[PDB]
Curated annotation (Swiss-Prot):
Biological source species: Neisseria gonorrhoeae (strain NCCP11945)
Origin organism lineage: Bacteria, Pseudomonadati, Pseudomonadota, Betaproteobacteria, Neisseriales
Superkingdom field: Bacteria
Family matches, as PANTHER family: LEUCINE--TRNA LIGASE, MITOCHONDRIAL, LEUCYL-TRNA SYNTHETASE
Gene that specifies this protein: leuS
Catalytic activity: tRNA(Leu) + L-leucine + ATP = L-leucyl-tRNA(Leu) + AMP + diphosphate
Protein name: Leucine--tRNA ligase
């Protein structure tokens, strides 16, 4: 064995050993328990950074742990390759997005290999390849004919100067980011997934996820935004029907989640596009201007929560169906047309938005809810005003005294009796628009025939192959300018027709890739039945909380869709979820910290990202210190959920520990060579060696619990460090001493193998001749945890009367019980009770 730690030499050697043994190339092995550990696959932007290293090292720690415990572990890697970063680099370097993508994959795959993750590279997928995306095209056509996917007009942001559709993130103050031109709102046909049809399933199945973080489930529930409310119709007053037709002439319909406060409604509000708004503004210019200012804005909830709530009265009136009050209709900029009925009632006394609105315009505020003896003040808002749990109704006639649900059900029956309303469940969830007017993306498998309409491409003709010899300019999708792509024949009638030129939302690729990994070479479906039956669901998922809403929702949606098609038989894709904390680093601009000395503007610390160029290139870290030093630093610096600060100090400390680990095994082997590890009964071992074995097996239990249950890797390393500390303070030079040292070192290297497998694989082979993965995860020797028993003297009134042998973990009650049961004590007690039993643990028990 070489004396000094040489990561640059041993890490490639260890990787070749693992590759030649095919330890990570797994099949559907019914002879082993499966374990599917998945890390969120990355965008091939060019090169990874320490954040990506942290993510994938975490996934590899869990994978290797389960591997050592005999699981058949699948840990697949792949590339989320479609998207805008390629197009922007395409128009910047004048290269095809595909070519820029595949070269990025090349460099990043070698970066990944050099870190030594235990990854089945035979299951690698790249989502921009037709062999992958043909199956989401397949699923699209299947759902399209069932109407789960449908086509309808929707609104987009059109830039008249760049001639491109832009997202809400590229429009700033109503203008394009790279043009500064006023953005038009165009209605264009687009394709949607009817995810609202699955809202109840998507919400309720969250309760199955007993091993998900509660905040992630909470975020899913709020995004879906289910409410149980009341449709309530207000009959239009006789003097306010001018210009209204249809149902709008006879009633105004609203949705509310607080029908228990319908008796406290003081005004009503409609959206600017509401027919009441249009009819009342036909002769009032001020209302036209307010309607125009309303449509001149985005319905973005981000902009609306800070938006100044404004409104104008209309002079029209409707009638509350419960108490007969005539209520004035207002046009309000907070009422959104297309959500519910486009109209709402207002109860300022119990809704904070309605309170501030009615405070600005001095509208009535009528209390209908009381929470105990709390005083109601119509000129201040308290939190208990909107209390839905501890309130009872007042000023409500029949309904006085009821709680929320009792008044709800009571109002429900009354409205249905008068035909003036009924209960209704609504959801904030909108359908999933998947059309993108971009080139680098999955083509939508639709053909437009002037006779047949929107026709899906037959399965035999899939994939619709995206042409890769394209260099986008940015003035519109190149597909719409390539007749050799869009000109085709109609698959229904054979006539001249045009392919759809929009491509799919790139979230679609990441909504099912975890299944494609189960059989990534299957050419008869999305995923083979046999492989789906074997791998079931993802056992462990690891990725940042930035993707905890849409991605997860979409992946869960697709899972149910694929299940309903008979492709899989699980309800939920991911059983456990781990959200790693972000890695941060001090920033510099005028720039990478490696191209900087310790002039440019030195600033503070923030997340590692290509935006500020604050990302430490791991390849420079590996060339400098080694893969194991990189992995150890990440796992040791902080709990995986906590944020991780880059530190040259932390890198050096980790490297010194690997040198210490190497030196420890080398100095042990040079003093006598390898021996059989201690095993069996430890009676006869010295106190110091019994204590070391206690430290050893206590450490094994602690690291096993930290990997498997708590998923805290920094404390697991600290526990092995303490074991080594006690090892260093123990005389292990005797025959029994060497045997225990062998046992300690054989366990330490296996306990650390998931975190630093290169050095541990090498050290193990110097200690033991068996395959490390065959030797398995270290077992706990429970006998090594039992400490010796103590002899306690029993005294009756201070006189020595007997002796008891107690455990080293006996309580004060066990010492009292054993002392009262001793024969010498029971004889000197003369049947008389004890006023006190003074107990000195380990010394004496005095019975008085
Ligand atoms: N289209 C709409 N635009 C704006 N506000 C609306 C609209 N429809 C209903 N509202 C108002 O929003 C209230 C609550 O609806 P929301 O979707 O916010 O449910 P919620 O947050 O679960 O309810 P709660 O605030 O009672 O807990 C309704 O009582 C009504 O006053
Ligand atoms: N600084 C970081 N620290 C920790 N994990 C990170 C960091 N940056 C990315 N990751 C994680 O690595 C995986 C891939 O990240 P990727 O950079 O591809 O996407 P992203 O987070 O959307 O990008 P961006 O950093 O530009 O916001 C995800 O699980 C993500 O949470
Ligand atoms: C699961 C996916 C949404 C993850 C992206 N490819 C990278 O952040
Ligand atoms: Mg269960
Ligand atoms: Zn046709």
């Amino acid at each position: 064995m070489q004396e000094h730690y040489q990561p640059a030499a041993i890490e490639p050697a260890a990787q070749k050993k693992w590759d030649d043994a095919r330890i990570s190339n797994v099949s559907e092995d019914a002879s082993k328990p499966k374990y599917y550990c998945l890390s969120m696959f990355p965008y091939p932007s060019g090169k990874l950074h320490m954040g990506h290293v942290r993510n994938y090292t975490i996934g590899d720690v869990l994978s290797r742990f389960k591997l050592l415990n005999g699981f058949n572990v699948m840990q697949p890697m792949g590339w989320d390759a479609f998207g805008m970063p390629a197009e922007n680099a395409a128009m910047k370097n004048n290269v095809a997005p595909a070519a820029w993508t595949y070269d990025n994959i090349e460099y990043m795959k070698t970066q990944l290999k050099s870190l030594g993750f235990a990854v089945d590279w035979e299951r690698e997928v790249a989502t921009c390849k037709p062999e992958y995306y043909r199956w989401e095209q397949w699923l699209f056509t299947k759902l399209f004919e069932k109407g789960i996917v449908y086509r309808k007009n929707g609104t987009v942001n059109w830039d008249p100067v760049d001639q491109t559709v832009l997202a809400n993130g590229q429009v700033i103050d109503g203008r394009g980011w790279r043009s500064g031109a006023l953005i038009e709102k165009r209605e264009i046909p687009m394709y949607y997934f009817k995810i609202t049809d699955y809202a109840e399933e998507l919400l309720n199945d969250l309760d199955k996820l007993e091993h998900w973080p509660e905040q992630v489930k909470t975020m899913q529930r709020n995004w879906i935004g289910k409410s149980r409310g009341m449709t309530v119709r207000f009959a239009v007053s006789d003097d306010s029907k001018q210009g209204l037709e249809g149902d709008y002439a006879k009633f105004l319909q609203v949705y509310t989640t607080r029908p228990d406060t319908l008796m406290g409604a003081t005004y009503v509000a409609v959206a600017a596009e509401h027919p009441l708004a249009t009819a009342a503004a036909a002769d009032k210019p001020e209302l036209q201007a307010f309607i125009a200012e309303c449509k001149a804005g985005s319905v973005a909830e981000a902009d609306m929560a800070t938006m100044e709530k404004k409104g104008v009265p209309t002079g029209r009136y409707v009638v509350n169906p419960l108490n007969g009050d005539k209520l004035e209709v207002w046009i309000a900029n907070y009422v959104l047309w297309g959500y519910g009925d486009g109209a709402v009632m207002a109860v300022p006394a119990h809704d904070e938005r309605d309170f501030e609105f009615a405070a600005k315009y001095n509208l009535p505020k009528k209390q209908v809810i009381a929470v105990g003896d709390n005083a109601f003040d119509a000129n201040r808002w308290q939190e208990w005003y909107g209390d839905k749990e501890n309130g009872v109704l007042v000023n409500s006639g029949d309904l006085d005294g009821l709680d929320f649900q009792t008044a709800f059900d009571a109002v429900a029956a009354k409205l249905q009796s008068q035909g003036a309303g009924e209960p209704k469940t609504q959801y904030r969830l909108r359908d999933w628009g998947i059309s993108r007017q971009r080139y680098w993306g999955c083509p939508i498998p639709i053909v437009h025939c002037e006779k047949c309409g929107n026709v899906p491409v037959p399965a035999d003709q899939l994939p619709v192959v995206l042409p890769e010899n394209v260099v986008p300019d940015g003035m519109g999708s190149p597909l719409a300018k390539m007749p050799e792509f869009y000109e085709t024949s109609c698959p229904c009638c054979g006539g001249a027709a045009k392919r759809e030129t929009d491509t799919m939302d790139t979230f679609i690729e990441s909504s099912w890739y975890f299944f494609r990994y189960m059989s990534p070479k299957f050419s008869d479906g999305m995923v083979s039945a046999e492989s789906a039956k074997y791998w079931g669901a993802v056992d462990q998922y690891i990725g940042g909380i930035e993707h905890a809403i849409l991605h997860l929702l979409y992946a869960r949606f697709f899972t149910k869709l694929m299940r309903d098609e008979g492709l899989v038989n699980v309800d939920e894709p991911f059983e456990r979820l781990l959200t790693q904390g972000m890695v941060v680093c001090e920033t510099y601009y005028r720039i990478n910290p490696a191209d900087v000395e310790l002039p440019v503007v030195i600033s503070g610390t923030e997340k590692m990202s290509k935006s500020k160029n604050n990302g430490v290139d791991p390849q420079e870290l590996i060339n400098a210190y080694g893969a194991d030093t990189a992995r150890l630093f990440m796992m040791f610096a902080a709990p995986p959920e906590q944020s991780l600060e880059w530190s040259d100090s932390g890198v050096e400390g980790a490297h010194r520990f690997l040198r210490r680990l190497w030196r420890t095994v080398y100095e042990y082997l040079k003093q006598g060579g390898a021996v059989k590890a201690f095993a069996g009964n430890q009676d006869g071992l010295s106190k110091e060696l019994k204590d070391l074995r206690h430290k050893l097996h206590s450490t094994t239990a602690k690291v096993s619990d930290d990997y498997g249950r708590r998923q805290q890797f920094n404390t697991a390393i600290a526990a092995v460090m303490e074991l080594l500390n006690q090892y260093d303070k123990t005389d292990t030079g005797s025959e029994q001493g060497r045997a225990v040292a062998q046992e300690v070192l054989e366990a330490a290297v296996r306990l650390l193998w998931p975190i630093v497998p290169h050095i541990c694989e090498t050290l193990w082979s110097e200690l033991n001749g068996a395959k490390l993965w065959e030797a398995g995860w270290p077992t706990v020797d429970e006998a090594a945890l039992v400490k010796s028993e103590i002899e306690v003297m029993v005294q009756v009134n201070g006189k020595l009367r007997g002796k008891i042998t107690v455990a080293a973990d006996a309580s004060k009650a066990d010492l009292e019980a054993a002392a009262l049961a001793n024969e010498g004590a029971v004889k000197f007690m003369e049947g008389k009770p004890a006023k006190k039993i003074i107990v000195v643990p380990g010394r004496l028990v005095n019975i008085v």
